[PDB]
């Protein structure tokens, strides 16, 4: 278990944005889009996300960056599909 979140609160000051950020990450794992960034002890995504904050590899900046990266990762696949919609003309 994770008894006290104090260490995570150190990493992100607000402690409310912690709930938000840890949430956003916890759903990335629960809905299967991704996998944990740190050994899962049988901890549910709630606690796995908190360990990821404690280890400093996940926060609002990183996630926004990663997501902004993934946007271009899908835009690369569909590149031909959506440009084939030239029928708009």
Q: Which of 77, 48, 63, 65 has the alpha carbon at shortest distance from 17?
A: 63
Q: How far is the CB of 68 from other proteins (least distance, A)?
A: 17
Count CB neighbours of 74 within 10 A: 9
- Contact between 57 and 37 under an 8 Å Cβ cutoff? The reply is yes
As a whole number of angstroms, the distance between CA 9 and CA 11 comes to 5
Query: Cβ of residue 26: shortest distance to other proteins, in angstroms?
Result: 5
Q: Which of residues 4-63 bind other proteins (CB under 8 A)?
A: 4-9, 13-20, 22-23, 26-27, 30-31, 42-47, 49-50
Output 50 or 58, the one with its CB closest to other proteins.
Answer: 50
CB of 45 to other proteins, least distance (A): 8
CB 59 within 8 A of CB 21: yes
Q: Which residues bind other proteins (CB under 8 A)?
A: 1-9, 13-20, 22-23, 26-27, 30-31, 42-47, 49-50
């Amino acid at each position: 278990a994770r008894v006290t979140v104090q260490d995570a609160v150190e990493k992100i000051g607000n402690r409310f944005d912690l709930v938000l950020v840890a949430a956003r990450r916890a759903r990335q794992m629960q809905v299967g889009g991704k996998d944990p960034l740190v050994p899962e002890e049988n901890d549910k995504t709630t606690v796995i996300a908190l360990r990821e904050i404690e280890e400093g590899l996940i926060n609002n900046q990183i996630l926004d960056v990663r997501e902004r990266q993934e946007q271009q990762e899908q835009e690369a696949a569909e590149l031909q599909a959506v440009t084939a919609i030239a029928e708009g003309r």
